[PDB]
């Protein structure tokens, strides 16, 4: 496992990359970055990721940051035929969209509230993000975020939603989200264990 | 049948999708969304994009929002062999990274300022410094390769908003050369950016 992932134990983007690597059976070495000590802020770390954020992948000297791009690369390079990242352009676009939607909106709004500051408008924006994902699940009428099977689009949304559970936020009125999120735990308990370990830390 | 793009005349994500469609010679119908009238906030618009943001693509009933995903889709669907979006996993990852970097960081920091505080100004310079760093390490003429890719358009249009406010970024040697070389090598594509720049300047 010469593939190296620099990650943090309670960070949803890190968890998503680990779940994908585990689901794809791609061996890797995990480096727990010492966030409290500022390890991601050193020049050595910036040699790998000039953005100074976690995670970053080192694939035989190829340094790749941005967890969405890391998710896409692990599939494209090591499992190009896997349904975890379909090759059909339309099906692939739904996955790509859901990845962008998590980065641009869903995780952005949810984490602003589940971290640090909790305001009426922040609470409203959590509900708007849930409403939009609920809307997407209603329109596709799929069991998972981008298809009727698990894809890399699921992991970032799962780990964003996990932070709501971490603060005992009730989102059960979002029927399809609640079912999708809980079905994930039952169908993929090994992958959920990665989210659950972080959830207990965030708690 | 013709693609339909719902866009706004002064929005960098809209401009990037138009440049890609034009570069790939994919024909489309342009719908200029009436932002001032709130057209992107109606229920009919939300049928296409529940996020209520611009742009959104309608490809014969397939509704796709998020400009980065739209860029990837038009390449994957209509020009899979194009060097504008390489198929080699590593080369593709550099493109994908640069798209994410624009969305998460470069456009986020630059637009917060060009649309002003000491910390916001510092964050503009950090974003420029990071992109300057990436260009130095790849030693490439463009953002992800020695040829134009879809990664270039979002970064070009983020950088255009600095020019729109007369922000001097010439200290960033490689960014300045890359940006100005784009205008000279691709004048038709730059005309799309320039028309918005004149609106933003007003």
Domains in chain B: ranges and CATH: 1-80 (3.40.30.10), 81-202 (no CATH)
To which H or E segment does residue B8 belong?
none
Nearest to B107 by CA among B28, B189, B162, B66: B162
Tell me whether residue B174 is exposed, middle or buried, using C-beta atoms within 10 angstroms of its C-beta: 0 to 12, 13 to 18, 19 or more: middle
Separation in Å, CA of B128 to nearest CA in chain A: 11
Interface of A with B in 63-82 (CB under 8 A): 64-66, 68-69, 72-73, 76-77, 80
Please state how this structure was obtained.
X-ray
DSSP notation for chain A:
--EEEEE-TT-HHHHHHHHHHHHTT---EEEE--TTTTGGGSHHHHHH-TT--S-EEEETTEEEE-HHHHHHHHHHHH-TT-TTS--SHHHHHHHHHHHHHIIIIIHHHHHHHH-----HHHHHHHHHHHHHHHHHHHHHT-SSSSSSS--TTHHHHHHHHHHHHHTT---TTSHHHHHHHHHHHHH-HHHHHHHHHHHHHH-
* Gap between the Cα atoms of B22 and A105, Å rounded: 28
To which H or E segment does residue B58 belong?
strand B56-59
Interhelix angle B187-201/B152-164, nearest 10 degrees: 40
DSSP SS3 for B59: strand
* Gap between the Cα atoms of A169 and B21, Å rounded: 43
Q: Which two tokens stand for residue A140?
A: 């596709």
Tell me whether residue B33 is exposed, middle or buried, using C-beta atoms within 10 angstroms of its C-beta: 0 to 12, 13 to 18, 19 or more: buried
Interface of A with B in 116-155 (CB under 8 A): 131-132, 135-136
To which H or E segment does residue B24 belong?
none
Q: Which two tokens stand for residue A60?
A: 């035989």
Subunit contact B73:A90, Cβ cutoff 8 A: yes
Inter-CA distances, B94 with B67, B87, B137, B142, B152, Å: 17, 11, 12, 11, 11
Nearest to B151 by CA among B120, B121, B185, B178: B178
Substitution target from B52, B96, B133 for chain A, most A beta carbons within 10 A: B96
* Gap between the Cα atoms of A53 and B87, Å rounded: 27
Buried-state track B45-70, b at ≥16 Cβ within 10 A, e below 16: beebbbbbbbbbbbbeeebbbbbbbb
Tell the residue number behind the tokens 């784009």, with chain if given: B182
Separation in Å, CA of A55 to nearest CA in chain B: 13
* Gap between the Cα atoms of A84 and A191, Å rounded: 14
Contacts with A66 from chain B: Cβ below 8 Å: 96-97, 100-101, 104
Subunit contact A96:B73, Cβ cutoff 8 A: yes
* Gap between the Cα atoms of B45 and A101, Å rounded: 17
* Gap between the Cα atoms of B163 and B136, Å rounded: 22
Subunit contact B73:A66, Cβ cutoff 8 A: no
DSSP SS3 for B41: helix
Q: What's CA A33's distance to the chain center, in Å?
A: 18
Subunit contact A93:B80, Cβ cutoff 8 A: no
Separation in Å, CA of A167 to nearest CA in chain B: 25
Q: Which two tokens stand for residue B118?
A: 């000491």
Q: Count other Cβ atoms within 10 Å, centred on residue A186.
A: 8
Subunit contact B89:A100, Cβ cutoff 8 A: no
Substitution target from A49, A68, A93, A146 for chain B, most B beta carbons within 10 A: A93
Inter-CA distances, A144 with A33, A95, B118, B135, Å: 31, 11, 44, 38
Is A98:A145 a contact under the CB 8 Å cutoff? Answer: yes
Residue A32 bridge partners (DSSP): A7
Contacts with B101 from chain A: Cβ below 8 Å: 51, 66
Q: Count other Cβ atoms within 10 Å, centred on residue A83.
A: 14
Contacts with A51 from chain B: Cβ below 8 Å: 101, 105, 130
Q: Which two tokens stand for residue A63?
A: 């340094």
Angle A66-A68-A71 (CA atoms, 0-180°, nearest 5)? 110
Contacts with B105 from chain A: Cβ below 8 Å: 51
Nearest to B5 by CA among B71, B50, B51: B71
Q: Count other Cβ atoms within 10 Å, centred on residue B119.
A: 9
* Gap between the Cα atoms of A158 and B118, Å rounded: 37
Tell the residue number behind the tokens 């305001």, with chain if given: A119
* Gap between the Cα atoms of A181 and B151, Å rounded: 33
| A vs B: CB pairs below 8 A | 82
Inter-CA distances, B47 with A174, B40, B57, B61, B157, Å: 19, 11, 12, 11, 28
Nearest to A73 by CA among A5, A158, A142: A5
Distance linking the first and last C-alpha atoms of chain B = 36
């Amino acid at each position: 496992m010469v593939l190296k992932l620099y990650a943090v134990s309670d960070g949803p983007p890190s968890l998503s990359v680990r779940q994908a690597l585990v689901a794809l059976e791609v061996p890797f070495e995990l480096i727990n970055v010492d966030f409290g000590a500022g390890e991601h802020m050193t020049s050595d770390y910036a040699l790998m990721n000039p953005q100074k954020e976690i995670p970053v992948l080192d694939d035989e000297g190829f340094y790749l940051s941005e967890s969405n791009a890391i998710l896409q690369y692990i599939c494209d390079k090591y499992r190009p035929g896997s349904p975890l990242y379909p090759q059909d352009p339309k099906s692939r676009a739904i996955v790509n969209h859901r990845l962008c939607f998590n980065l641009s909106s869903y995780y952005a709004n949810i984490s602003a509230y589940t971290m640090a500051e909790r305001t009426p408008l922040g609470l409203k924006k959590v509900h708007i993000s849930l409403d939009v994902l609920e809307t997407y699940l209603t329109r596709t009428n799929t069991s998972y975020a981008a298809a009727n099977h698990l894809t890399i689009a699921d992991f970032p949304l799962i780990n964003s939603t996990m932070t709501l559970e971490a603060i005992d936020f009730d989102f059960s009125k979002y029927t399809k989200i609640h079912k999708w999120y809980n079905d994930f735990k039952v169908k993929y308990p090994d992958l959920w264990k990665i989210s659950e370990s972080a959830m207990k830390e965030i708690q």
